[PDB]
Amino acid sequence: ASMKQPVVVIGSGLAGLTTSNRLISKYRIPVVLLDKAASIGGNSIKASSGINGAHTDTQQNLKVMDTPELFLKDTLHSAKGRGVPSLMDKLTKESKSAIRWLQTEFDLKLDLLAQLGGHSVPRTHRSSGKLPPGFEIVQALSKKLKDISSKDSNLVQIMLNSEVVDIELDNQGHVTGVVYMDENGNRKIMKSHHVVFCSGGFGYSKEMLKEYSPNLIHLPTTNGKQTTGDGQKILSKLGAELIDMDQVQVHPTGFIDPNDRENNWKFLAAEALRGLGGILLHPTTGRRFTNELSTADTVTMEIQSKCPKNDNRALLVMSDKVYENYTNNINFYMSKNLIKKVSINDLIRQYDLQTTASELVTELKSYSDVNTKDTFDRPLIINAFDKDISTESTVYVGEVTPVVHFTMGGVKINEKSQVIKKNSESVLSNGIFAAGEVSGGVHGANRLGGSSLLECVVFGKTAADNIAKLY
Ligand SMILES: Cc1cc2nc3c(=O)[nH]c(=O)nc-3n(C[C@H](O)[C@H](O)[C@H](O)COP(=O)(O)OP(=O)(O)OC[C@H]3O[C@@H](n4cnc5c(N)ncnc54)[C@H](O)[C@@H]3O)c2cc1C
Numbered sequence: 001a002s003m004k005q006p007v008v009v010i011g012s013g014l015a016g017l018t019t020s021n022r023l024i025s026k027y028r029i030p031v032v033l034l035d036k037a038a039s040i041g042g043n044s045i046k047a048s049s050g051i052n053g054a055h056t057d058t059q060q061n062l063k064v065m066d067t068p069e070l071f072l073k074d075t076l077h078s079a080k081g082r083g084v085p086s087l088m089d090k091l092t093k094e095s096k097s098a099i100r101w102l103q104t105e106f107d108l109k110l111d112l113l114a115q116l117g118g119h120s121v122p123r124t125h126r127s128s129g130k131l132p133p134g135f136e137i138v139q140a141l142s143k144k145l146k147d148i149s150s151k152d153s154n155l156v157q158i159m160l161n162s163e164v165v166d167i168e169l170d171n172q173g174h175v176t177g178v179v180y181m182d183e184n185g186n187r188k189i190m191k192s193h194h195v196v197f198c199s200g201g202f203g204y205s206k207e208m209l210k211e212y213s214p215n216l217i218h219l220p221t222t223n224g225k226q227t228t229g230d231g232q233k234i235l236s237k238l239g240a241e242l243i244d245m246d247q248v249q250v251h252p253t254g255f256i257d258p259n260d261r262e263n264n265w266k267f268l269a270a271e272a273l274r275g276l277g278g279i280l281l282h283p284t285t286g287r288r289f290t291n292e293l294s295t296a297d298t299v300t301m302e303i304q305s306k307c308p309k310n311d312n313r314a315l316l317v318m319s320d321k322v323y324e325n326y327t328n329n330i331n332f333y334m335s336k337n338l339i340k341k342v343s344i345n346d347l348i349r350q351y352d353l354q355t356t357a358s359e360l361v362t363e364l365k366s367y368s369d370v371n372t373k374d375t376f377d378r379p380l381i382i383n384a385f386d387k388d389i390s391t392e393s394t395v396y397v398g399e400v401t402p403v404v405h406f407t408m409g410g411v412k413i414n415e416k417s418q419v420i421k422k423n424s425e426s427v428l429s430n431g432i433f434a435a436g437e438v439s440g441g442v443h444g445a446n447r448l449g450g451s452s453l454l455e456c457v458v459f460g461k462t463a464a465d466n467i468a469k470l471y
Contacts, residue, residue: 001471003154006032007194008178010164010231013042014134014453015436016198017141018460021105024148024156027468031156032190033145034180036163037226040142042200043437044456046224047134048270048329049116050126051457052450053099054092058111058125066121068093075451078118078295079444082244083408087442090415091451091458098457099125106140114272115380116449118295124272124450130328133453162188166234167195167432175431194431194471196463197419198456201407201437202229203248209404212245221404222254222268231438235411238432241422243440245409249447252299253280253316254403255338267338269316269400270329271296271449277322277383279367281315282307283399286353286360288367289314291376297446300402313401315351321383323396330396339398345391357391364389406447410440417463430470435459 007023009016012035023029035042053059054071071092079088102108108127115122126133142158149156161183168177168189177189202208204227209217221227236242253274254266274280274292280303282289290302307314318339323330333339342350345357355363366372368384386393411434412420414427421428436456443451 001027001029001468003028003030004471005192006030006190007196007467007471008190008192009033009196009198010178011035011042011198011200011436011438012040012142012158013044013198013200013436014137014141014456015460016196017138017145018457019196019198019435019464020156021141021144022461022464023467024145025105026464027471028155029468029471030154032192033156033158034162034164034178034190035160036230037224038161040158040160041138043224043227044453045134045138046268047453048132048268049272049449050114050124050133051099051110051137051453052123052448053095053125053454054123055096056099056125057103058099058113059123061111062113064113064121064123066123068095070120071095071123074118074120075448078446078448080446081444082247083444084441086415087413091442091455094458095454098454098461101457101461102137106144108137108140114275115293116271116275117293117299118448124275126272132329137453164199164230164234167238169238169429173429175429194467195433196467197231197235197411197432197434197438198436198460199231199438200227201410202232203227203404203407205229209248212409213248216248216250216404219250219402219404220254220264220266222251222266223404231434232410235419235428235432235434238428239422240428241412241420243409243412244444245407245440247408247445248404249296249406249408250300250402251296251405252303252402253400255333256313256399256401258337258399266401266403267333267336268403269333269338269398272326273316273318273322275380276326278316278318281317283311283313283315283351284308284354286348286351286355287363288376291378293378293380295446295448303402313399316398316400318396319383319385320394325383333398339396341394341396343392343394344389347395347397351397361389361391406452407437408440408443408445408447410434410438412441413439413459415462416466417459418466433463433467435463
């Protein structure tokens, strides 16, 4: 492409980083990357479990059989008759290419798997090594932009502390600029004909929860304070359709910090902790009470009903075998005092359980006996407890509680990632796209673990590819 006005990408999470890289590297289309925060990555950089992909090289290497058809099956079942099926088809059918794109263009290994709740096979990818997936992916894609900027600063500029407040359109009805407030609070205009909203969800905003799902306003959240639904409100005022805004995902296992128990913000206890073998104990009786590997809305519903109405939490318990397959993450969690290594005798007393140590041993040995039917029908039991566990054996334990986590609703988009005008099938504007958590319809009533990072790559690349046909 010959250089014209920049494409403005709003948000430096995975959606924005994907859009930016695809635009610069494949077509030489110049980018200005705005973010209202003081650092890159949003909630993407916090991602812990990984990114989904169906029929990958990694699944081939590990001899798991998976297809775009099966992924779509699990996705449709999780959505519960909400959402937009061609978006669910597109997400699962492009998942192979998304994984391969990260592998070949950035040398991200993504060589390990985990099976999360509501998945029929393991398909959530992470790389071996010391870096969790959200940080490793964001670091790689953002470093490439800085490398490119360093050789040609007019090809990409990253402008942090820049809050978009509106899009200016001409008499009818095309993009001419993006209005933003700079670091000093001064109103600025970036002239452009193309904008991609990659600005994230709205889970942090109590004001918007009160409007779209008021029952959740007292819950704590995993979301960064920047997660305030800005893009959703801007595009709605400009005439865009919003969909599924009342579908808010409450994640069942946010960590309780024992020295900060009532912080509205929680570290997340990754769903990979359960898929890789973790179980949940009731915090008074000390017994298992639910299928830990169901979808997030179901686990949350089980905790909120079966655990105490006041003090609504649970103990996430993980074996040594879990630890050996998730070592660096659990070491991190322990560094924040969120997970403790404790003998079973001491487990009973520090958590004031009703079960005896010998009784808990008997339960754990039964749980780990794959030849006995699981009480709660758990579909995958791996990395369980040693057949000769005793009351002096050690386990890893944290306290967890449900948290507002992800907003399935957002602005209506199509398969080209273009924003849909209210009450229409026509795009709101030739030059307005959206990608990632800011958009609605991809997940319906519940998002499967691992699918939002995936959504960012799939629809970030798509917006970039379709802008190139219009630049
Ligand atoms: C702790 C945590 C762990 C997670 N782990 C996983 C996982 O393992 N697998 C998975 O699939 N999903 C995971 N998720 C969900 C997923 O990471 C997020 O949905 C993902 O970050 C969405 O990417 P995004 O690019 O749309 O938004 P974000 O990553 O949130 O980026 C949005 C950016 O837009 C910026 N912004 C907001 N408003 C403006 C504005 N007006 N102007 C300019 N910039 C603005 C924000 O500051 C932010 O940086 C996790 C989420 C959290 C909170």
